[PDB]
Amino acid sequence: SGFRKMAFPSGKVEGCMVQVTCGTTTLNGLWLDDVVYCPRHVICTSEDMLNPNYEDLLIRKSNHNFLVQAGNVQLRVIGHSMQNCVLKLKVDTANPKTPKYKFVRIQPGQTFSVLACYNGSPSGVYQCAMRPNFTIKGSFLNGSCGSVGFNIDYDCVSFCYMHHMELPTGVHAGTDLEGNFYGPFVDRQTAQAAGTDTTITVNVLAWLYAAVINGDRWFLNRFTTTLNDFNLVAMKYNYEPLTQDHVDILGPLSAQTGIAVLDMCASLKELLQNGMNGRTILGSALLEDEFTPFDVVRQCSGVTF
């Protein structure tokens, strides 16, 4: 019993966190094998960031300009290259703590654990979702750039995010590990705004299934709906469209709880039109959308890593 916002164990990622210092800037780097990945804005000062030519700024840097520190051991940089918005600092020493890993680009709605670091030192781990507007609602302070978002698949760390910046609303923007930003964001000091967000419909339904599994059934009703009728209501309440893929992915939960996906959709349709009526679902007065259908299964099944 119990449902918590649960992150993947961060041990495999902690062994990769290093501190990258370039001039006045100090941020975090991900050390995998003999390469240290970090945001490319580390090479920039407050002057460069306004309109930065990163190719030109990098050509002026030498390997000794980058100070990489793994614990209290200074790593020597023997190369530097750039892949999109990530800087790849080739180092002489391969990280012995390098886990089995992949670089994966995630889609909006997909969740991941964030290992927040400051000065190459992990300070906290939290679970969050890639918003449909491509921002994350993280918890980050200055110096957390280079902090990574990840999932664990069996014994393989899939790195899916690297924190670059904080938008004026307090939401965060970053890239996948290939340096490609999530969303219409750029690593330059300019007017950037996160788009109007939407609710991750499949994740709300996944969390409603997790509430049923936990004994919270008040929101259930005798009704079912067409996927088209549900999507009309969802569109109106700033909810993401629920595709047939989402209905299929919610299948095992529908089987476990005995409530069809379109049946649970009718419960959500009612909750949107009438509210919670002072009641809570899993100790929450709002519909939670940061648990994917897989996260609910993993938590209510106890999958280990």
Ligand X SMILES: CO[C@@H](C(=O)Nc1cncc2ccccc12)c1ccc(Cl)c(Cl)c1
Contacts to a second copy by CB under 8 A: 1-12, 14-15, 115-119, 121-128, 137-141, 143-144, 166, 170-172, 214-215, 276, 280, 283-286, 298-305
Closest to a second copy by CB, 103 or 126 = 126
Identified binder of ligand X from the candidate list 19, 26, 110, 144, rule CB under 6 A: 144
**Stated length of the chain:** 305
49 binds ligand X (CB under 6 A): yes
176 binds ligand X (CB under 6 A): no
Q: Is 303 exposed, middle or buried (0-12, 13-18, 19+ CB in 10 A)?
A: exposed
Contact region with ligand X (CB under 6 A), list: 29-37, 71-79, 139-147, 288-296 = 139-147
Identified binder of ligand X from the candidate list 1, 51, 72, 304, rule CB under 6 A: 1
Closest to ligand X by CB, 189 or 224 = 189
Q: Is 279 exposed, middle or buried (0-12, 13-18, 19+ CB in 10 A)?
A: exposed
CB crowding 26-62: b at 16 or more within 10 Å, else e: bbbbbbbebbbbbbbbbbbeeebeeebebeebeeebe
188 binds ligand X (CB under 6 A): yes
Q: How far apart are CA 94 and CA 18, in angstroms?
A: 13
Q: Taking the complex as a whole, how short is the minimal distance between the CB of residue 277 and a second copy, in angstroms?
A: 12
Q: Is 286 helix (H, G, I), strand (E, B) or coil?
A: coil
Q: CB–CB of 185/160 below 8 Å?
A: no
Identified binder of ligand X from the candidate list 21, 189, 214, 256, rule CB under 6 A: 189
Is 163 one of the catalytic residues? no
Query: Would you give the DSSP letter of residue 275?
Result: -
Q: Taking the complex as a whole, how short is the minimal distance between the CB of residue 120 and ligand X, in angstroms?
A: 15
